[PDB]
Amino acid sequence: ATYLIGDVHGCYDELIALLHKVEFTPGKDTLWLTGDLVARGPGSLDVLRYVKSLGDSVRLVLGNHDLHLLAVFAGISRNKPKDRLTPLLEAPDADELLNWLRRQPLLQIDEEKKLVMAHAGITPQWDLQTAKECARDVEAVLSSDSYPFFLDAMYGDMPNNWSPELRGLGRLRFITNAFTRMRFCFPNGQLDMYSKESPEEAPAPLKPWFAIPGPVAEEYSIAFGHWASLEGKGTPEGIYALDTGCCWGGTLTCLRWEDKQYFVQPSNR
Ligand SMILES: Nc1ncnc2c1ncn2[C@@H]1O[C@H](COP(=O)(O)OP(=O)(O)O)[C@@H](O)[C@H]1O
Ligand SMILES: [Mn+2]
Ligand SMILES: [Mn+2]
Numbered sequence: 001a002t003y004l005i006g007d008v009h010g011c012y013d014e015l016i017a018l019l020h021k022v023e024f025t026p027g028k029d030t031l032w033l034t035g036d037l038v039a040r041g042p043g044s045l046d047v048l049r050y051v052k053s054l055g056d057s058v059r060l061v062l063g064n065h066d067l068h069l070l071a072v073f074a075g076i077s078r079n080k081p082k083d084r085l086t087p088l089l090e091a092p093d094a095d096e097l098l099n100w101l102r103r104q105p106l107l108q109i110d111e112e113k114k115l116v117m118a119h120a121g122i123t124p125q126w127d128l129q130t131a132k133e134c135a136r137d138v139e140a141v142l143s144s145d146s147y148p149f150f151l152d153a154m155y156g157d158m159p160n161n162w163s164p165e166l167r168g169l170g171r172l173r174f175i176t177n178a179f180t181r182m183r184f185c186f187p188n189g190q191l192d193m194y195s196k197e198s199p200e201e202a203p204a205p206l207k208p209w210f211a212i213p214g215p216v217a218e219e220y221s222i223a224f225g226h227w228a229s230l231e232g233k234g235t236p237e238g239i240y241a242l243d244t245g246c247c248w249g250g251t252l253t254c255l256r257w258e259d260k261q262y263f264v265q266p267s268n269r
Contacts, residue, residue, distance in 0.1 A: 001022075001030075002029070002113070003029060003256055003257070005034070005252065005255075006232070006242030007034055007035065007036040007063065007225040007226065007246070009036055009037070009065070009246060010040060010084065011041040011247055012043030014252045014266075016050075018254050018264075022263055026054055029057065032223065033058060034223065035062050035180070036063035036119065036225060036243075037060070037063075038065055039083040040065075040082065040248075041246070044069075044088045045097075048088065048097045049097065052097060052101075060104045061108055061179075062104055062179075063120075064119065064120075069098070070102050071151040071154075072085065073094070073098045076151045106118060106134075106138055107131060109132070114220050115222075115223065118131075118135075118222075119226050120178070120182040120209075120227070121182060121239075122209075122222055124209060124214030125161070125162040125214070126215075128215070128220070134179075135179070137171075137175060138150075138172060138179070153169050153173070154176045156169075158170070160174070160192070174191075178191065180226070181226075183196060183227050184202060185207060185208070196227075198229045200234075210235060210239045220238075221238045222238065222240070225241075225242050227241060245267075246267050247267070247269075249269045250267055252264070253265075
């Protein structure tokens, strides 16, 4: 079977309890994870160890907190105590774990399931081929010996409008924001980088990225995490918001793809 789980955020105990509830069996089952495996919850170290150990039985996409962790590890960004990353950063296998983490995709595609996963979703300004190329471009930088320079460049909120003409720093920053930070769009598809509230509490004319018809969403289902204030609710058919805020005292949600059945694990917090 195929299981999809939203943002874990170091909530290792809840992740394992949820997987035991469905009797997840590597080799027979496959787990998809929407990213943000680390930070806020207490068990980032254990989560990375476990997910890395799954090998081909897990399909991960990186989120914004995974990238921030990489930036801290490389000395590009300062550690925040509230992220609770020190045990992971100080672990004897930190290098092995983070060098594995930075080689993971930004985007997962399964044609037989007609299923696409990214941390924040797929901007309506992208078709599938563009999304694939952009993912490949950023993944190439992250898996290279020079990834600290990319991480340092990634921070920034502009440009917020896609063009095949974008080059250099602006192109990479847009790709990163689209994959790992996007929530709301302007009517033309342009990204807003400030509102993090629920669709009902947002100011006009902002709309959820998934409320704007885009070519990927017309052909494929899309699963994503990231947007906790959405609470996994209010999406159209074919759009699956899996982040229900476990690390915030909400729940960890698992979706079995074959029957679209939900399984939920309450936060221990
Ligand atoms: N259920 C919720 N309702 C409203 N806001 C929430 C909810 N859960 C989390 N938030 C808020 O969402 C804001 C952004 O958190 P999050 O969605 O995890 O994304 P980010 O990676 O940008 O931090 C946080 O400041 C948090 O207070
Ligand atoms: Mn996120
Ligand atoms: Mn998150």
